C-alpha cells in the first residue's frame, strides 16, 4: 500500500523460504550465500525441509549474548544449490527503538501476509516460554501463532524475526550486522 509494505515485499519475495522442522513450519530469512536465520525453538537438526525439499544442514548455531543468555536466533547454513541476495547492508548495527514497522509472514497456511505493527520498543529482557531472553523487540500484536520466523522491517532496515507473543503484544529477536560478519 505504501513504502513500508514495498520494502517488506522486496525482502519477502527474494530473501524468505518456508522451513519445516519436527517443531512445525517457520518463515526463514536468508541473509547472504547459503546462510539463514530461524527461531531457536524450531530445534534445527541435521536435515531440514526448505520449500518441501529435503536439505542437509551444514552448520547451525544457537546465538547467546556474552552473559550466556539466549538470544532466540539460530544461524543455519543450508546445503542448497543457490545463494540468497546479500541483505547484510539492511541490518542495524546497534540495539534501537523503531517507528512504523511491518511483520511479514510466508507459510503454506498464511501465504504473503503483511501486518503493520507500528511502534517497536527495545524491550530487552523477556522470560520467553520460561527461557530468560535478551535483545527483545516488543510491538502491538493482538492475535495467535504461525508467525514465528516472520520478518520485522522498517523502510530500509531488516530489524528482527518474530519469536512469540502474549495475545496482546508480539516479540522479535534483534538482528544485528555483527551476527553475520565473515
Ligand atoms: C490471522 N492471522 C494469521 C497470522 N497472523 C494473523 C493475524 N491476524 O490479525 C493479526 C494482527 C492483529 C491485528 C492484525 N495477525
From Swiss-Prot:
<feature type="active site" description="For protease 3C activity">
    <location>
        <position position="148"/>
    </location>
</feature>
<comment type="function">
    <text>Major viral protease that mediates proteolytic processing of the polyprotein. Cleaves host EIF5B, contributing to host translation shutoff. Also cleaves host PABPC1, contributing to host translation shutoff. Binds and inhibits host IFIH1/MDA5, thereby inhibiting the type-I IFN production and the establishment of the antiviral state. Cleaves host MAP3K7/TAK1, resulting in inhibition of TRAF6-triggered NF-kappa-B induction. Cleaves host TICAM1; this interaction allows the virus to disrupt host TLR3 signaling. Cleaves host IRF7, resulting in inhibition of type-I IFN production.</text>
</comment>
<feature type="active site" description="For protease 3C activity">
    <location>
        <position position="41"/>
    </location>
</feature>
<feature type="domain" description="Peptidase C3">
    <location>
        <begin position="2"/>
        <end position="180"/>
    </location>
</feature>
<feature type="active site" description="For protease 3C activity">
    <location>
        <position position="72"/>
    </location>
</feature>
<protein>
    <recommendedName>
        <fullName>Protease 3C</fullName>
    </recommendedName>
</protein>
<comment type="subunit">
    <text>Interacts with host IFIH1/MDA5; this interaction inhibits host IFIH1.</text>
</comment>
Amino acid at each position: 500500500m505504501g513504502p513500508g509494505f514495498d520494502f517488506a515485499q522486496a525482502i519477502m519475495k527474494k530473501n524468505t523460504v518456508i522451513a519445516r522442522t519436527e517443531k512445525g513450519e517457520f518463515t526463514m530469512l536468508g541473509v547472504y550465500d547459503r546462510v539463514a536465520v530461524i527461531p531457536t525453538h524450531a530445534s534445527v537438526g541435521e536435515i531440514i525441509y526448505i520449500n518441501d525439499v529435503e536439505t542437509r544442514v551444514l552448520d547451525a548455531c544457537a546465538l547467546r549474548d556474552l552473559t550466556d543468555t539466549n538470544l532466540e536466533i539460530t544461524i543455519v547454513k543450508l546445503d542448497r544449490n543457490q545463494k540468497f541476495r546479500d541483505i547484510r547492508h539492511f541490518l542495524p548495527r546497534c540495539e534501537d527503538d523503531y517507528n512504523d514497522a511491518v511483520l511479514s509472514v510466508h507459510t503454506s497456511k498464511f501465504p504473503n501476509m503483511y501486518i503493520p505493527v507500528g511502534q517497536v520498543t527495545n524491550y530487552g529482557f523477556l522470560n520467553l516460554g520460561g527461557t530468560p531472553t535478551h535483545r527483545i523487540l516488543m510491538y502491538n500484536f493482538p492475535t495467535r501463532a504461525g508467525q514465528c520466523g516472520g520478518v520485522v522491517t522498517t523502510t530500509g532496515k531488516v530489524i528482527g524475526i518474530h519469536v512469540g507473543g502474549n495475545g496482546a503484544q508480539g516479540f522479535a529477536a534483534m538482528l544485528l550486522h555483527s551476527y553475520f560478519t565473515d
